[PDB]
Symmetry: C5
Subunit: 270 residues, 5 copies
């Protein structure tokens, strides 16, 4: 980014010294065409940011739903089966493993320490064996519920009430996968990013006639505004990207683990 | 804050007086500032402020909506209790005290304030202790109300279906909780508003210099008009920053909690 | 409206600007068009977004009222389909749904619902309803009681009770939503600063145009002013959809439509 | 394109008047620069952008509601086949009500006579019942609901499976409600008609402010600009009524025909 | 950046450079004629066109996003239908395998239908020939696949191995898929209103044709270069709608439906131990 700003000031000085030689040749750059162009580019950057922002908000809503559905499902297990503490403890394990597994899957990092921390090793091997480990964890949680239903402890209705929450988590997994696997067609976005780059390099040659020595200052102010618009659009396109802020994901996984522990009577020391 | 915008309006007037005074020296030295580049930059900044303001506004509308749903789902949970168990008035009173405690607690959570007093007013001390030990008191309150209807289900007074009908309302509330906690911890990205406010400040400070060649002694008036408009647009979005905050523009959470409590008390024959 | 005033005041501002154009440079004041281009275009962006929010606020009100008709229609359909012989319960529940609509309309218009309520319900319930600070919620509660006593009497199962309970929820979200809209406006900081800015812009504009247009200034200025005043006025015009203005929902017509729909479904 | 080409060539006329009256600008003392009209024209374009957004939202919603007719009717028939596979007389009756519902909804939105379509589909007794209601699409929904209600009363459906079908009837009621709200409530006219008149006036005055610059080009760029602006305006006006009959409105007859072909796919036959 | 669109931008860009040459070597006979073109009207026109392009392309992009989302729902709903089968009927593997083959068949059939290709080989790889016959005799084969999966769980309900409740839990997923099928068919028959794209392509075409005659008086010999830059911005922005016209198509920025169907199949096989 600062490379393009500094390249901007040097095309500014090139513009200044080169300026007047080409102009008497009949080589003119005026401000009005570039103002037409830049206003068009700015409108497109508004919309492109709107889209990227939507993708960011969607990632945040999906994770929020992890917290809601996992909270609600443990609430249901306590309210409906208060005495099945072993089942509570097992299911809570799978729910926390699911959150961490999801975060590692999206960020493309190794889930093995979190899995091995939370789950028996037979099931950690079953999970790491699958090419879709988060989905497998959802399956295993489903098995705990379905076993409680075979054993008579849940009816089909209360089983159904919890099955809904496992559907809420399946909705989260697929949504996050789509958000991580494919970004908005950059087909238009790359074309627009290059147009922005060319616009900012040519800008000093369009401004020098008006601003003389002030050309590099105003030129980098304008170029800075535009390049920030384009780069924030790039950063928001990609909530799970390789250079993303991992703090709110890490914070979300920790919050839900703390909630489920504090919830099952395991958080407050005896 | 109003003091920021009047103070930087102040400063803009100053800047334009510097621009007026120094214009004579401006042309010999090689400096020229024309209006057209600042028209391009200003229109772009305005486009970006439109979109950002749209983000802020929609954050504030969502916060108001979530609270609307607190009132809706709590009203109908009490309605289901009365319609399904007309005789079970002890459960009526206890669940109403948990729903009311949930609302006040949500307010305290969002406001980062201590809910001990409201809890003690509505609940027996043992439950207050249980709720305060939790890292999420509103969650523990939803769990306790759920124990009320769950015990009703174990006594055979609720079937699995009517139990489930009320359980869903505790779902409507968990989603409100998640929504509010999400909004609280997820602002409009700081890069946006910080870069935007730096750009607006620099833009307004530089503007009178671009105006002076054209307006001469009119530079301060026009410059301050334009700057007022822009500083208004920028500050308004950060004035919708925390809808759960304390300020004239922020949601009146205390009044809304009183409306909720009044509603739930009205529905259970209480004064 | 205040538009015709501000337009005439704009004509006067423009005449002043013409007659005062002489002493302009004598005073040292120079005013071009380009700064006002910048500012007017920005104001117009902000007005387009603002009017957008106002518009969506109006749309949501029309939608909430649309859901009343949908949910009461299908609660009645479920009554006739699940208990086709229970006409006395038909009449009681329909009178509650219709009363809910008119009560909602009166509460939003801040009028007394008593005539409609007593026209629809027994006095014994009407007093319970108006004894409450939330009459429309109380009416929802009572309709719930009709359904619930049907369930206790074995006439509805828990399942078919639940399928009607869901429609009661559809109406609770409508009530809460309308009450929210009625007390939650698009932040009037928008509208106020924007309106002042539109006005000051409209009065200063001819002084910035006279140097370039001379005697033509009043026409271009009134045109531009009309456009900006028009947009600002529309945002103020769509702010309260539940009111009685020409641009507001025909709430009375809508309540008549709901009531005739449910009476047609019940033979009555 | 009836009104708009009339106004386009009327704009060629106004440009010609502007040209031959540029003769008199020097002597009458009238400058008319382009910058004030660029400002005003950009404001008008912004408002036309937003207005087209509102119109497009109405049109996309209308299209979606109709898509929900096909989805809900399809799954209701599917449930009837999966739950009561042998009840073909019920199959046929309910399907006839649902197809009737599509056509009835279309005629209601278009304000046309449904009698023919109803008669092609249902017995004449039910046709007169439906025609007697002032809400015939709603009455058709009530009648589909009576078919399901009977299947329940006869013990052929339990309350669960009855409810699974009742939900789809609710999906159709939200469609009816949504179309009625769209067809009877438009976008307010403080926008539409003040903005439309504003666009007209701007277009007629533009060439007068452009002769100063373009002299004989002013009819060409004036007509170009009026083309794009009048297009924006009339497009918004067309799409705000998406159940209308303009060329850019929804093809409701093709949608009803698709729905019919679906539910009656191979004389209504289906694998057990 | 695919076939039919790129050809048009290159041609209109060549049209542009040529119009700019003519403009340059003919500007000298302007004021003598009375034809004059200034930048300011074309700034008005260009900025109006750009606003309308912004809105339009916002529609096109939303349409692409919806197609992607509908396909993601296929994955989610089939995943959970299989999960439910395992958790409610764990011993009923035969039924598991049949229902899985119908769900995979549904995905492949939806791909073929949206590309208008022949589903017969995929269907015969997944299903017994009688089933393929039933499916392909329908005028709506993918919907018919849904009806057959409904029959599988309906038989499970008849045999008492599913209660009405749990039968209903899987029925809701079958109409999670019915929502997908209707949505794809609607998108496939409902573009962004062609009036938008056609009028926009025309005003952009004319605008880019007249631009160099409006820029020449300012830019002299620079006219071709920025005229082609500006024309690039407008032409490619106007091309976006056609790029995103066919999200179910086969181009590079067209959705990767075959890999998505492969992924769905691998997911269900993984879930059922095959
Ligand atoms: Zn426990
Ligand atoms: Zn699901
Ligand atoms: Zn802890
Ligand atoms: Zn509710
Ligand atoms: Zn939930
Ligand atoms: Zn009570
Ligand atoms: Zn009756
Ligand atoms: Zn009676
Ligand atoms: Zn009264
Ligand atoms: Zn559906
Ligand atoms: Zn049949
Ligand atoms: Zn409904
Ligand atoms: Zn001439
Ligand atoms: Zn198996
Ligand atoms: Zn393609």
């Amino acid at each position: 980014i600062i490379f393009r700003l500094l390249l901007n000031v040097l095309m500014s000085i090139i513009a200044i010294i080169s300026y007047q030689w080409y102009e008497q040749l009949g080589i003119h750059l005026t401000v009005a065409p570039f103002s037409l162009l830049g206003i068009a580019i700015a409108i497109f950057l508004g919309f492109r940011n709107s889209a990227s922002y939507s993708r960011f908000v969607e990632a945040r809503n999906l994770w929020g739903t992890v917290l809601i559905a996992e909270r609600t499902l443990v609430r249901q297990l306590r309210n409906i089966l208060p005495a099945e503490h072993d089942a509570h403890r097992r299911i809570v394990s799978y729910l926390v493993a699911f959150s961490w597994s999801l975060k590692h899957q999206l960020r493309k990092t190794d889930p093995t320490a979190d899995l091995r921390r939370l789950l028996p090793e037979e099931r950690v091997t079953e999970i790491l064996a699958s090419s879709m480990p988060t989905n497998r964890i959802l399956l295993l949680a489903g098995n705990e519920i379905g076993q409680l239903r075979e054993a008579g402890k849940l009816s089909d209705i209360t089983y159904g009430l919890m099955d809904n929450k496992l559907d809420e988590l399946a909705h989260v997994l697929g949504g996050c996968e789509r958000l991580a696997t494919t970004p908005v067609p950059f087909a238009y976005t790359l074309i627009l990013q290059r147009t922005v780059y060319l616009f900012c390099t040519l800008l000093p040659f369009a401004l020098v006639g008006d601003l003389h020595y002030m050309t590099p200052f105003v030129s980098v102010f304008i170029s800075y505004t535009f390049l920030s618009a384009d780069s924030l659009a790039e950063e928001l396109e990609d909530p799970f990207g390789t250079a993303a802020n991992d703090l709110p994901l890490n914070a979300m996984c920790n919050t839900i683990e703390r909630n489920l522990l504090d919830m099952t009577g395991q958080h407050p020391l005896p």
